[PDB]
Each structure stands twice: as C-alpha cells, then as structure tokens.
Amino acid sequence: ALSDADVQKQIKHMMAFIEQEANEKAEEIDAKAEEEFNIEKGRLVQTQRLKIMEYY
C-alpha cells in the first residue's frame, strides 16, 4: 500500500538509516580520537621518561 501510513513508515526508515550513518561516523571518529590521544600521551610520557631516566 502507498497510503500515508506507508509513506510515514518509509520516511521513518530513512530517518533511522541517516541516524545510523551519523552514529557510525561518530563511532569511527571517536576511535580515531582515542588512538590519537593514546599516541600523543605515549609520546609525551616517553619524552619525560627520558629526563627521569637520565637523572636517576
């Protein structure tokens, strides 16, 4: 049926799909941010570890 109910259901499916796309983009960017944070933290902690090890 091509009634208003069917049109609303199709529009709702489209809304759900766009929400899924946004959610997946957010998940990907969040993982990228977490890895970037981890690598930057490791770099800085290694740089300070150099000085600490040298002194001790």
Binding site: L2, D6, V7, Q10, I11, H13, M14, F17
Partner: peptide
C-alpha cells in the same frame, strides 16, 4: 504507479541497500 514501485523494489534489491526507496 504500482509498476513503478515494483521497479523501485527491483532497484533496491539489485543495489543491496536495506532502506527502501519511497514514492509519494
């Protein structure tokens, strides 16, 4: 209109997209 909707159904199946195209 029904034939066009059925054609859109073929298009959806061939493309493999879960979401169905909608006519109004």
């Amino acid at each position: 209109l029904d034939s066009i909707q059925f054609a859109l159904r073929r298009g959806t199946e061939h493309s493999g997209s879960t979401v169905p195209s909608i006519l109004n």
